[PDB]
Design a binder for this molecule. Sequence first.
Ligand SMILES: Cc1ncc(C[n+]2csc(CCO)c2C)c(N)n1
Ligand SMILES: [Mg+2]
Ligand SMILES: [Mg+2]
Length: 214
Amino acid sequence: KTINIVAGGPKNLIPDLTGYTDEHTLWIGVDKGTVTLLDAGIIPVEAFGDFDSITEQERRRIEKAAPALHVYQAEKDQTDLDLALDWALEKQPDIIQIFGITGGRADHFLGNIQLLYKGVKTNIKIRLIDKQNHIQMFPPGEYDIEKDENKRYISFIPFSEDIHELTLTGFKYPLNNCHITLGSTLCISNELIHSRGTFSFVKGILIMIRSTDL
Ligand SMILES: Cc1ncc(C[n+]2csc(CCO)c2C)c(N)n1
Ligand SMILES: [Mg+2]
Ligand SMILES: [Mg+2]
């Protein structure tokens, strides 16, 4: 099953959620995010955070449209989003997808990025999504990707430590059992030259950004 979380970032950086709706995909709203869900026509099963960020009318509008909507509050020491993720990881879905993850405040995004770290610990696919990016972290292993018709760039960035024996295949910029040192931006702006591409490394935490220039 799939769980989709919509955090409270600005709506303009968020994709069409509609096309992400499916019979095996539950939704949950976080902060303004639950408001975003209602506008799109999706009702959250649960909602996390408080209302000090949502408007008077906005609250009424939610209540009218979702009376039995339960809202779990945070403890100021854990982000609303951060809290929603525990609820979702617990459910153990094959995939968690988060939206409203980018915005004006950089801290916001930088945070969400750390959230992905909690996902490798639980070996559960956690993909972050916005209008032009798909972020995902991977532990050592061997992974396949398909060419993306709308986003042509695929970047790789080391996380906790150095990346060991990184191999890229089906990419414009190949790599064979390469050692990527922490902080390196060599593996940014790559592309797929085939229909399927493969990448793999033996040690470290790798980040993968698939993007577009619009
Ligand atoms: C493994 C690997 N991946 C991507 C690039 C290409 N690249 C690196 S930096 C950048 C943007 C600035 O030119 C681009 C396109 C490479 N050389 N090696
Ligand atoms: Mg929208
Ligand atoms: Mg708050």
